[PDB]
Design a protein around this ligand. Structure first.
Ligand SMILES: [Zn+2]
Ligand SMILES: [Zn+2]
Ligand SMILES: [Zn+2]
Lengths: 186, 75, 74, 49, 196, 92, 101, 184, 119
RNA sequence: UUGGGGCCCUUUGUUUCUUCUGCCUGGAGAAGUUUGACACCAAAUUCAAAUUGGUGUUAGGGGAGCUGGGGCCUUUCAAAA
RNA sequence: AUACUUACCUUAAGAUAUCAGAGGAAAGUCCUACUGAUCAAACAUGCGCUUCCAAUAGUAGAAGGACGUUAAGCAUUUAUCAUUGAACUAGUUCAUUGAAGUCAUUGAUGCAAACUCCUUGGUCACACACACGGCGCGGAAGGCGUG
RNA sequence: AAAAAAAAAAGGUAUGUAUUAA
């Protein structure tokens, strides 16, 4: 081409030569100004609602929705979960596995191994002070240890020292497990 | 996302075709990302140049959806 | 430069009356006082009349969709 | 100088660009004069010793 | 930003929902100019809202014209004018010298004994003296061309950036049309606006 | 996508257009965006009914474009390499 | 508040609200109550049917569809009816949808 | 995102219309890309078609009719020869590519409208484009207004006589040996 | 919810895709894209005859139908049979799915449950 | 190793895997095969090499070894009837 | 390739088959080269699976083209609007003024034929063999199945 | 009885200037 207004030099520009001009074909379609979708849509008639009854008497009862029952199953199931949680929430001065002495001296151990023993926990808990009472949480249906316990100590200051020392660092190592520690929380 | 580049066009008298039939000529003022183009001293071109041509308003704005091609008759 | 919707905001506060052309299929053009607008260029027009294409009937305060907007002209 | 910078640059910024160019050239001339004065002072200091 | 309707909703919310800031009837603010350049950083105070801007620029037609905005706008701008002048001073301190004059002292040394020779022999004496001082001036010129070879340029007062004399104009146009230089150009003019 | 990148690769070369209105704009392509709206230089125009004119500059909306004809030698252009080996991107 | 600010779950609560409380609640209440609906498309003929499913775009899955379309040439009219058991309808064609009593 | 420019093979980070427009216009990218299409274009001429051969069983008739026809000798150049002759032929094709005989522009040089047509910078159709086609010219004429009033007499020791028509190098011995008249 | 995810479980079923042109496509269905791009295999696609004493059918759909290359010369009415048609999504109007399949099994979306089961 | 016959030689740059030698009264010989070699394109200088930037080629066939898969046969074992 | 100067600019988000069961850190989550089912991809590998793969016992033929000729082929239909004056029937011709005006009329539309030329194929092997509709070697394109 | 500090440039493209041989 002659001018080639481009980055390329003359030899590269003449290499990009386009195909010859497109031949003219008369349009077979509707001009853009004439283009529209179907106008004068007949609205929904009183005569259409009058013809509704032929459809209504033929199919009076719709097919049941069994894909909605899958959702009505799970939501009702959630409501029943909330009801069981309601059964648990109504149930610490009664419990008397928890009726041991003043809660200010009650220190809670958790994540203890289920194979653990009362002597070792008496030593690890006895490290921070003298032990007043001790109670280990076991399931009611069977004696398997739940992994948590409550230790009443002679003074609340020693119980707080045990919570901070034992519970504030890594958890206190007991048997093969790291055991978290906190206050009674109940 | 990206603004159309009319930057060389603005303030120059420009003809642009509204929809299929119409052709409007005016001095381009501003534009946006949808190519909505506002221009002043608008005139609607028709077959008879002095006769059927009638001005629109002091300021006219155009929806970018009805814009087909935009030619500047100017430098 | 004068962004177009800025210009429309200058149609809102300056209270200038505007004629607005719709798509070529409908066949009516609206005119009234543009009050406020949205990002979609659909505008509320106070004291609007619909003219077929001067005996047109008055509309009201009417929300007009931006999809059918072609021109907004003073 | 106008024909060289007029092609690529927009015409609206061509005026202020031109004025800034002339100002820069003037500053260059001033720096040259200052350097010449310093050279003269150095020559006088070399002649005094 | 992802879609045009979102950006356009952002712009329309800028159009339609003390704050001071932008002030003077022409553009400005210190911050808006330098965004994306190395110099200025991010969020800036108050709000340069097109609604407030249209209200104020329309009050220019109303002509209430109480340049309290300009009296805050000198406290804002002239500080940046002084900052740029200071950066100019720092650059002038940096550029001119280096290890530099060491070798130049060396050059002076190569001159010293030269310029001495005359006073020892005092026609051929003053001739050898003239050629000696000529060689000295040549050495000094070579040293100046060497320090220029390290840095040959003049710092523009406007943008505090360096401009070589040998790059002629057409390269300098890129520096003059940049955001930094053009912005500082406007801020200087704004200082002149506020001095009146 | 590759189809738009090929249109960006066609800048500065003679291209043809078909707008959905039926016209044909053949001429040199100056600018193109990712919205496919292009602007052309020194272009010959064919109206839908065949009347041909000439205009120096044109800008068209990408939504109204139907097909674009691009110089054939762009067929072997590197965009169409299936298995290609890029280096590692710079860390920023 | 724009949609790009919200998180992944806030969009789910938003769609749950729009279906439960909103315009499309006309269709939702029609799906649960087994009430037949009338739908006008832009193709200018109307289906009397029953909605088994619907969606944001308004595209909806139908059961016992009855399509009614009339045509006229030079003011000569004929009414045609076409029965379908189950159908899937793309939502861009519809314009008005009413809930029968 | 990031814009990978596969011509230069170098990434550019966070594509933007400004930076990408600057890279595409860049001189280095220009050379790289132009050379790339120079290679991809020279290949289609370089590549041999190598169309597949389909050999059928020669019939008894044409083997007898073709047996009486004597066998023709074939010529095959040496490798050292064929390399050189291929070089020469290719360089001849490159020559015929660039010829583009302009002699008409040399004929009308002194015409009254020569400045408005053949100068091609000052024209109408192509005139305005050449200005924008001028390179950015970073660092380091024939105006249209001419009239016939300049150069009133086209010959005053000014013009060179028209250049002789060329001749093929191969057949250059074909020329009539002697001219009909005595030139100076 | 995206109801298009329903169509993706309808794979390998006989279906009619009734387009905006009025063109109807009977065929075996293959993978449906998220944009509702529908790809079929063995298809017979045709146009209905409005009777109404010769009312001219769609003029664009006849041309588009002959230009598939699948219309055979000796077809008296207007039809075409071909293999592998790929249909853009926005062209679809109605989809008539078979009577045999049950919706209650297919209309359960796993994401809808997954959102509720997790909360 | 020689002779005879048949078909092919468009392999068109006379077997196209390179390079070098070479061929129709012949189908050949030498070197080489992927951190490499070769061909080609582009430049500006130097002034015919290289320099820098790019595109492409490094092939086909058979056999031995080793290894993956499949079908069939014989033997040994486990379960069931 | 290195150094300096100037300009232009910087991170949409998340994820990598599903379902179910058992286990580890009442609810939920995460995880198990854990167990099953289904799905998908790649790679192998099979089906008396389906279709196709050109004359030399001759100067052919099949598919697809010509943006090829005959060819001004044959048959049809088309060549601007407005204003003023003269004549004219009761629309027509000529002259002047203004506006736009793809080229074509050897055109465009319809109809049909003849000719010429391009690209493509296993131009393979065995066979010139009186049957009731096979079980040569490969290549191309599919469908189905196992691993 | 109580007490006291922080760790950082990034790197892409383009333009101009200088260097890399008889
Ligand atoms: Zn600010
Ligand atoms: Zn400066
Ligand atoms: Zn590049």
């Amino acid at each position: 081409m002659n001018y080639n207004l481009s980055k390329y030099p003359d030899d590269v520009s003449r290499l990009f030569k386009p195909r010859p001009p497109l031949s003219y074909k008369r349009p077979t379609d509707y001009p853009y100004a004439k283009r529209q979708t179907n106008p004068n849509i007949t609205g929904v008639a009183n005569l259409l609602s009058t013809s509704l009854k032929h459809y209504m008497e033929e199919f009076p009862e719709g097919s049941p929705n069994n894909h909605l029952q899958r959702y009505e199953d799970i939501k009702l199931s959630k409501i029943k979960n909330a009801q069981l949680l309601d059964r648990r929430l109504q149930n610490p001065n009664v419990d008397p596995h928890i009726k041991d002495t003043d809660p200010y001296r009650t220190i809670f151990i958790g994540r203890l191994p289920y194979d653990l023993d009362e002597i070792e926990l008496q030593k690890y808990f006895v490290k921070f002070g003298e032990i007043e009472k001790i109670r280990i949480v076991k399931d009611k249906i069977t004696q398997k240890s739940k992994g948590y316990a409550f230790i009443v100590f002679k003074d609340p200051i020693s119980s707080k020292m045990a919570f901070k020392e034992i519970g504030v660092h890594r958890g206190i190592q007991i048997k093969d497990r790291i055991c978290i520690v906190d206050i009674e929380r109940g | 996302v990206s603004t159309p580049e009319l930057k060389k066009y603005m303030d120059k008298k420009i003809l642009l075709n509204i929809n299929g039939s119409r052709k409007v000529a005016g001095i381009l003022r501003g534009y946006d990302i949808f190519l909505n183009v506002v221009l002043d001293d608008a005139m609607e071109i028709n077959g008879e140049d002095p006769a059927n041509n009638h001005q629109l308003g002091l300021q006219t704005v155009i929806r970018g959806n009805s814009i087909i091609s935009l030619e500047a008759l100017d430098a | 430069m004068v962004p177009p919707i800025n210009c429309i905001f200058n149609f809102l506060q300056q209270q200038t009356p505007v004629t607005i052309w719709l798509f070529e299929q409908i066949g009516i053009r609206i005119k009234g006082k543009i009050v406020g607008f949205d990002e979609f260029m659909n505008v509320v027009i106070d004291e609007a009349v619909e003219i077929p294409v001067e005996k047109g009937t008055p509309l009201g305060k009417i929300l007009l969709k931006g999809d059918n907007i072609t021109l907004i002209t003073s | 100088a106008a024909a060289a910078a007029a092609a690529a640059a927009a015409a609206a910024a061509a005026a202020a660009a031109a004025a800034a160019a002339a100002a820069a050239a003037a500053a260059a001339a001033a720096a040259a004069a200052a350097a010449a004065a310093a050279a003269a002072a150095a020559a006088a200091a070399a002649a005094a010793a | 930003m992802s879609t045009p309707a979102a950006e356009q909703r952002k712009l329309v919310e800028q159009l339609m929902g003390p704050k001071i800031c932008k002030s003077y009837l022409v553009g400005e603010c210190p911050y808006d100019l330098f965004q994306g350049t190395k110099q200025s950083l991010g969020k800036c105070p108050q709000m340069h809202l097109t609604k407030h801007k249209i209200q104020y620029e329309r009050e220019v037609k109303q002509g209430k014209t109480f340049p309290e905005f300009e009296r805050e706008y000198l406290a804002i701008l002239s500080r940046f004018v002084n900052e740029c002048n200071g950066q100019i001073s720092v650059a002038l301190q940096n550029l001119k010298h280096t290890a530099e004059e060491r070798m130049k002292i060396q050059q002076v040394t190569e001159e010293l004994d030269v310029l001495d020779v005359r006073i020892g022999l005092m026609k051929l004496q003053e001739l050898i003296s003239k050629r000696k001082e000529v060689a000295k001036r040549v050495r000094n010129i070579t040293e100046n061309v060497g320090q220029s070879a390290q840095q040959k340029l003049q710092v523009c007062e406007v943008c505090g950036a360096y401009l070589s004399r040998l790059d002629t104009d057409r390269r300098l146009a890129d520096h003059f049309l940049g955001k930094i230089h053009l912005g500082y150009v406007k801020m200087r003019e704004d200082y002149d606006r506020l001095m009146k | 996508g590759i189809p738009v990148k090929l249109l960006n690769e066609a800048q500065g070369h003679i291209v043809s257009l078909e707008l959905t209105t039926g016209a044909t704009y053949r001429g040199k392509l100056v600018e193109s965006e990712d919205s496919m709206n292009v602007q052309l230089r020194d272009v010959i125009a064919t109206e839908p009914q065949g009347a041909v004119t000439h205009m120096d500059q044109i800008f068209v909306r990408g939504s109204q474009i139907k097909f674009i004809v691009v110089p054939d030698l762009l067929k072997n252009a590197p965009l169409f390499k299936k298995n290609s080996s890029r280096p590692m991107p710079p860390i920023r | 508040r724009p949609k790009h600010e919200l998180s992944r779950a806030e969009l789910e609560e938003l769609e749950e609200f729009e279906f439960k409380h909103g315009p499309m609640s006309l269709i939702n209440d029609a799906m649960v109550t087994r009430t037949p609906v009338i739908i006008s498309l832009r193709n200018n003929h109307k289906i009397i049917a029953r909605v088994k499913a619907f969606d944001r775009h308004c595209n909806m899955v139908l059961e016992n569809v009855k399509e009614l379309w009339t045509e006229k040439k030079g003011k000569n009219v004929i009414n045609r009816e076409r029965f379908i058991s189950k159908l899937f309808l793309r939502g861009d064609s519809v314009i008005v949808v009413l809930k029968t009593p | 995102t990031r814009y990978y420019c596969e011509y230069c093979h170098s990434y550019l980070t966070h594509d933007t219309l400004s930076v990408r427009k600057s890279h595409l216009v860049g001189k280095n990218h220009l050379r790289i890309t132009a050379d790339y299409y120079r290679n991809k274009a020279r290949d289609i001429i370089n590549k041999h078609n190598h169309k597949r051969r389909h050999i059928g069983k020669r019939g008894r008739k044409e083997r007898e009719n073709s047996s009486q026809n004597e066998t023709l000798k074939v010529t095959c150049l040496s490798n050292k020869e064929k390399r050189h002759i291929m070089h020469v032929k290719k360089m001849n094709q490159k020559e015929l590519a660039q010829t583009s005989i302009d002699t008409l522009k040399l004929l009308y040089d002194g015409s009254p409208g020569y400045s408005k047509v053949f100068v091609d910078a000052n024209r109408f159709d192509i005139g305005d484009l050449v200005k924008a086609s001028k390179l950015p010219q970073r660092a380091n004429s024939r105006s249209r207004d001419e009239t016939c009033e300049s150069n009133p007499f086209p010959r005053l020791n000014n013009p060179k006589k028209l250049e002789p028509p060329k001749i093929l190098s191969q057949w250059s011995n074909t020329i009539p040996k002697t001219s009909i008249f005595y030139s100076v | 919810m995206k109801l298009v995810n329903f169509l993706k479980k309808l794979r390998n079923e006989q279906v009619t895709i009734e387009l905006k042109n009025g063109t109807t496509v009977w065929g075996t269905l293959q993978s449906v894209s998220p944009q509702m791009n529908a790809i079929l295999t063995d298809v017979k696609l045709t146009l209905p005859q409005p009777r109404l004493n010769k009312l001219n059918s769609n003029g664009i759909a006849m041309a588009s139908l002959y230009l598939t290359g699948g219309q055979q010369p000796t077809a008296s009415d207007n039809i075409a049979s071909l293999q592998y048609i790929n249909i853009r999504g926005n062209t679809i109007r109605q989809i008539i799915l078979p009577d045999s399949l049950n919706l209650d099994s297919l209309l359960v979306d796993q994401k809808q449950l997954n959102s509720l089961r997790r909360s």
